[PDB]
């Protein structure tokens, strides 16, 4: 430790930036977010500064550097392109004992500005002293993955709640157990972000009433189509906080390698298990006060039977939420360079499954993009019917298997070849029909 | 933000602690490790101060608070059990514009001391600012598990190499590609921790020798419909590393706070299409990392094709990260599942207005067993009501408009088809129109909020 990190309260304190270009604008925004009473000294300003000055948000002083602008200041920043000026500013502040930063130069400055993760009042700052700014960027990326946006909201609420955390919890050990289910109860977090100050109470007293070991909720989470990068932030946060993960084949191992190692896993997909057993497993492991995560390929509410799994839980009074995901259509479209819409090619995208019967004349109408989920088997009779109902036989067709994954296969061509091309693939695969499939020869950036 | 974190260089700068107990000792240890010229001024001192002064590491002043002792200082810590004394200290630091800390009063004074995770020269600082100390330790301990031990050695060796990297690579782009390869090299990390110099050099020489890609790139990122938690991991990596971010009206302020602070942002809302094409094409010419940040998914009514079509021929590398489309987002947050059993066998994503001429194929849209989702159809609600009824759709078919779906300003109004026109008047862009029997599932699956 040769830098001491301190968290400064800058609201209504005079702070000086010397320089009027892009780098000053990024430091000025930073210091404006924190409530500095800010002056900016420069030989000229990029328009964004003249805007801020008109909204009364800071003060501009045009001209050369005047060291008297430091007379009543608490922090200084050199952010010009002239090392002579920066050196003058740096030297004017050391004799006044104003902490000072030189953007150009970590050395020869009395403070360094780190990377920040803002969740006010909660804050995390990362630096390595000027040695490795990229490595701090990498740390900041990861930390932004991991901290819910609304954690600051719950941070705050914990404030005037420490009152009650003693007249209903005696030992410091149980006191921390409560605190631990507090900061992870996203139903409280969403309730606070959405100002719903009755969902907030109903969950505040459910936290003081229910036994200390009970945290029973269900979270339906979309895994996305296969690529672990295609998970959502809230999705990742949720599978970090899960007591149990109930998952099937359609969830990739890359996604499962993200699930906390000290967490129960129930494999529920197939081997070589009807819907209602899955419903009972979820119900069962939630009534035991465990935080359940149901992980499903793609998006839960698109052919995932997500609806069925949540109406089993609405009977028994079990909280739940849904974190959506990338359905296969979106992924496969993007990772094969076949946009579902483009210009006036198609007025509508149709996501269709493969009792009752499919309406055939509807599927042949022009100005559509047909996307068939679970249709490899019925693929034979699909080419027959579309031709029989008047679709042009030169209509491009594409089948995308293991979309977005490091083994993705794409097979394209023409509607007349549809039956031949469906043997060349296996589940999970997507049939895409329409004129946009011709775009892959210019847009395919994956293979 | 309520505090601005900075990292002070304390070597040879005077600081005052006032008070002399177990608290004062802890802060004094912190300031001594940071190389400060320390004065402690207290009425009595626990033994640890006595020993520190013996070895000539701080100056002791036994007596009541001496304001003049501030006159030379960069930081003051008030650390006594007397609030009256602590405030006199805070008031003397304020008149001299010296950042001051009061251990008993996080809300008074000028700076707060965070918890520290040392991986010197790597440091992570955590604080909830006094509101939550429990979450501080809970976060601090979790962070302690994520950062390896050898992260310090990698970082120390990175600074030693920083001079060589600046002479050898000319532009900013290729130093960036050097450092990205450097910090994800697990072999190079183990060789430093094992103090194996022959292996450090071998890997270092090969790295300096690799040709680096000088080209820029453009990445279409789907921002999702609004909630910042619905961005994808890949999409966070792109905007956390991007040089320029071209964004539009339909990207929320919460998503934009996730862009790298030292990147420039160009707005394209209210600008036509062929201009966006060129501004992208122009900003990628400088060989920078251009992110085009689009609400929703970029291939569902975002004209992501038009943008990338230029660059297949202009020799620019590009790729696309998909996003949560407004349909998937609004369904999950309205309680309205898009499919369900055989309520619907298919889901239609439809545009609200066509290319001037051309009529929507209402015969097709009117078909049974499908969920209908109209994008940017608000201003045409009344005609969708008419036409659908004209082409067979029943009258009591439920409908829902999800205005601003997935944000904290989300409104949802529902009804039946014959009310579609008046429902649209009490909503504003951006809104989605959902039509079909899955809308009835709302009163059982709504978990988000009663608006
Ligand atoms: N990675 C993938 N590549 C190609 N098709 C996929 C896929 N993942 C899922 N699918 C398609 O989706 C079907 C599973 S049923 C629905 C999947 C999920 N609810 C989603 O939103 O995508 C499979 O039959 C297959 O047609
Ligand atoms: N958060 C939101 N809530 C409701 N409708 C939204 C929305 N975000 C986008 N939309 C709809 O999308 C239209 C723009 S078209 C671009 C959307 C993008 N292709 C996607 O996948 O989402 C808007 O007119 C609006 O009708
Ligand atoms: Cl650094």
**Does B159 reside within a domain?**
yes
Q: For residue B232, which residues of chain A lie inside 8 Å, CB to CB?
A: 224, 229-233, 326
**Does B399 reside within a domain?**
yes
Nearest of B325, B347, B331 to residue B230 by alpha carbon: B325
Same domain, B291 and B366: no
Give the minimum alpha-carbon distance from B361 to chain A in angstroms, rounded to a whole number.
9
Same domain, B333 and B441: yes
CB–CB of B260/B242 below 8 Å? yes
CB–CB of A104/A95 below 8 Å? no
Same domain, A400 and A430: yes
Alpha-carbon gap, residue B234 to B238, rounded angstroms: 6
**Does A377 reside within a domain?**
yes
CB–CB of A150/A192 below 8 Å? yes
Alpha-carbon gap, residue A158 to A137, rounded angstroms: 30
CB–CB of A427/A376 below 8 Å? yes
Same domain, A361 and A264: no
Q: Which residues, including other chains, have CB under 8 Å from residue B198's CB and lie 6 or more apart?
A: none
User: Which ligand approaches the C-alpha of residue A134 most closely?
Assistant: 3
Same domain, B176 and B223: no
Alpha-carbon gap, residue A193 to B410, rounded angstroms: 12
Closest CA to ligand 2's atom 23: B376
Same domain, A382 and A341: yes
Alpha-carbon gap, residue B332 to A322, rounded angstroms: 6
Residues with their C more than 2.5 Å from the N of the next written residue in chain B, i.e. before a break, are: 270
Alpha-carbon gap, residue A185 to A180, rounded angstroms: 9
Query: What are A122's strand-pairing partners?
Result: A119
Rounded-to-10 torsion of CA A328, B366, A344, B293: -40
Same domain, A296 and A344: no
**Does B290 reside within a domain?**
yes
CATH of the domain at B186: 1.10.8.210
The answer to whether B310 is annotated as binding is: no
Suggest the residue from A189, A192, A233, A389 to mutate for an interface test with chain B (most B CBs closer than 10 A).
A233
Catalytic residue set of B: 248, 270
CATH of the domain at B338: 3.30.950.10
Q: Could you list which residues have their CB under 5 Å from ion ligand 3? A: A 128, 130, 132-133
Which segments of A are annotated as binding site for S-adenosyl-L-methionine?
Answer: 225, 297-299, 302, 327-328, 374, 403
Alpha-carbon gap, residue B190 to B295, rounded angstroms: 42
Same domain, A344 and A310: no
Resolution (A): 2.8
Compute φ and ψ for A340, nearest 5 degrees: -65, -35
Alpha-carbon gap, residue A166 to A172, rounded angstroms: 9
Rg, chain A, Cα only: 29
Suggest the residue from B299, B343, B361 to mutate for an interface test with chain A (most A CBs closer than 10 A).
B299
List A186, A227, A243, A248, catalytic entry: A248
**Does B140 reside within a domain?**
no
SS3 B216: coil
Q: Which residues, including other chains, have CB under 8 Å from residue A2's CB and lie 6 or more apart?
A: A129, B9, B10, B11, B34, B35, B120, B121
- The yes-or-no answer on residue A270 being catalytic is yes
- The yes-or-no answer on residue A198 being catalytic is no
In chain B, the number of structural domains is: 4
Q: Which residues line ligand 2 (CB under 6 A)?
A: B 225-226, 250, 295-297, 300-302, 325-326, 330, 375-376, 402, 404-406, 430-432
Name the residue range of residue B405's domain. 327-445
**Does A270 reside within a domain?**
yes
Nearest of A221, A186, A208 to residue B449 by alpha carbon: A186
Ligand 1 pocket test: pick from A229, A328, A330, A429 the residue with the most ligand atoms within 8 Å of its Cβ: A328
Alpha-carbon gap, residue B249 to B431, rounded angstroms: 14
CATH of the domain at A60: 3.40.50.720
Ligand 2 pocket test: pick from B269, B295, B332, B350 the residue with the most ligand atoms within 8 Å of its Cβ: B295
Give the minimum alpha-carbon distance from B295 to chain A in angstroms, rounded to a whole number.
14
Tell me which chain B residue has its CA closest to the CA of residue A441.
B312
Alpha-carbon gap, residue A191 to A197, rounded angstroms: 7
**Does B39 reside within a domain?**
yes
Domain closes at, from A113, A128, A154: A113
Cβ atoms within 10 Å of A274's Cβ, excluding its own: 6
Alpha-carbon gap, residue A351 to A328, rounded angstroms: 10
CA A399 to chain centre: 29
Domain closes at, from A266, A301, A326: A326
User: Which ligand approaches the C-alpha of residue A301 most closely?
Assistant: 1
Domain closes at, from A267, A295, A326: A326
Same domain, A309 and A337: no
Same domain, A318 and A335: no
Same domain, B313 and B335: no
Nearest of A283, A281, A275, A265 to residue A320 by alpha carbon: A283
Write b or e for each residue in A352-378: b if 16 or more Cβ atoms lie within 10 A of its Cβ, otherwise e: bbeeeebbeebbbbebbbbbbbbbbee
The experimental method behind these coordinates is X-ray
Same domain, B267 and B162: no
**Does A203 reside within a domain?**
no
Nearest to B367 among A113, A228, A362 (CB): A362
């Amino acid at each position: 430790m040769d830098h001491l990190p301190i968290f400064c309260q800058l609201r209504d304190r005079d702070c000086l930036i010397v320089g009027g270009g892009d780098v000053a604008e990024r430091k000025a925004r930073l210091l404006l977010e924190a409530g500095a009473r800010l002056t900016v000294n420069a030989l000229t300003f990029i328009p964004q500064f003249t805007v801020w000055a008109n909204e009364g948000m800071l003060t501009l002083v045009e001209g050369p550097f005047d060291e008297t602008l430091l007379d009543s200041c608490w922090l200084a920043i050199a952010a010009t392109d002239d090392d002579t000026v920066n050196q003058r500013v740096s030297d004017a502040a050391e004799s006044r004992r104003i902490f000072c930063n030189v953007v150009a130069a970590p050395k020869a400055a009395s403070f360094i500005m780190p990377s920040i993760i803002d969740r006010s009042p909660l804050m995390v700052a990362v630096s390595a002293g000027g040695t490795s700014p990229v490595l701090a960027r990498l740390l900041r990326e990861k930390l932004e993955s991991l901290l819910p946006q609304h954690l600051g909201q719950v941070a705050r609420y914990a404030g005037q709640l420490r009152a009650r955390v003693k007249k209903q919890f005696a030992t410091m050990g149980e006191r921390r157990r409560f605190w631990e289910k507090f900061f992870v109860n996203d139903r409280l977090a969403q309730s606070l972000a959405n100002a719903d100050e009755k969902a907030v109470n109903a969950t505040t007293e459910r936290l003081f009433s229910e036994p200390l070991d009970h945290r029973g909720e269900v979270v339906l989470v979309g895994a996305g189509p296969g690529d672990a990068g295609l998970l959502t932030l809230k999705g990742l946060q949720q599978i970090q906080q899960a007591d149990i993960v109930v998952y099937d084949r359609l969830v990739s191992d890359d996604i499962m390698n993200l699930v906390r190692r000290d967490a129960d896993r129930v494999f529920v997909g197939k081997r070589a298990v009807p819907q209602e057993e899955i419903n009972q497993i979820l119900l069962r492991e939630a009534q035991k006060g465990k935080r359940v995560v149901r992980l499903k390929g793609g998006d839960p509410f698109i052919f995932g039977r997500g609806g069925e799994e949540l109406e089993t839980l609405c009977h028994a009074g079990i909280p739940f939420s849904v974190v959506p995901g990338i359905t296969a259509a979106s992924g496969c479209s993007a990772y094969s360079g076949i946009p579902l819409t483009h210009r006036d090619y198609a007025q509508s995208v149709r996501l269709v499954t493969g009792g009752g019967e499919l309406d055939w004349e509807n599927l042949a109408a022009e100005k559509q993009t047909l996307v068939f989920y679970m249709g490899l088997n019925q693929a034979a009779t699909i080419q027959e019917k579309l031709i029989a109902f008047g679709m042009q036989a030169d209509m491009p067709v594409a089948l995308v298997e293991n979309g977005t994954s490091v083994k993705q296969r794409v097979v394209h061509g023409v509607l007349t070849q549809l039956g031949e091309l469906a043997q060349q693939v296996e589940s999970p695969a997507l049939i895409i029909v329409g004129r946009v499939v011709a775009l892959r020869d210019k847009l395919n950036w994956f293979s």
